[PDB]
Amino acid sequence: AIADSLRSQANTLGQAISNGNDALGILQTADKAMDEQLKILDTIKTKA
Amino acid sequence: AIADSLRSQANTLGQAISNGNDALGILQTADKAMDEQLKILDTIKTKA
């Protein structure tokens, strides 16, 4: 029983790592996207 | 955040330099144009 609980928990954590990596990918994409908007706003202010 | 604020300030100042140079050109043009009016007025007084 203990070994089965530990196996279930180990599999759950091995999947949680992948969930975390997916969240990392999404957030990195979002930030690297925001970078260009920052540069564009800088350009707008310079033109003004 | 600070890096972007300072980049915005650097770009704004770099454009302000060009605005100042344009103002300098305009004022120099106006003054060197007034010079001939001064000489003409001198000539008019001499003829009177």
UniProtKB/Swiss-Prot annotation, chains A, B:
Entry remark concerning the domains of this protein? Interacts with FliS via its C-terminal domain (residues 537-576), interacts with FliW via its N-terminal domain (residues 1-44). May form a 3-way complex of flagellin, FliS and FliW simultaneously, in which FliS and FliW do not directly interact.
Q: What is this protein called?
A: Flagellin A
Task: Spell out the subcellular localization from the entry.
Answer: Secreted; Bacterial flagellum
Quote the range of the complete protein represented: 49 to 96 of 576
| Organism whose genome encodes this protein | Campylobacter jejuni subsp. jejuni serotype O:6 (strain 81116 / NCTC 11828)
Family to which the UniProt record says this protein belongs? Belongs to the bacterial flagellin family.
What does the annotation say about its assembly with partners? Heteromer of FlaA and FlaB. Interacts with FliW. Interacts with FliS.
Gene this protein is translated from = flaA
What this chain does, per the entry, is described as: Flagellin is the subunit protein which polymerizes to form the filaments of bacterial flagella.
Which residues belong to the signal peptide in this entry? none
Gene inactivation phenotype reads: In a double flaA-flaB deletion, cells grow faster and are non-motile, flagellar filaments are non-existent.
Induction details = Translation is inhibited by translational regulator CsrA (at protein level).
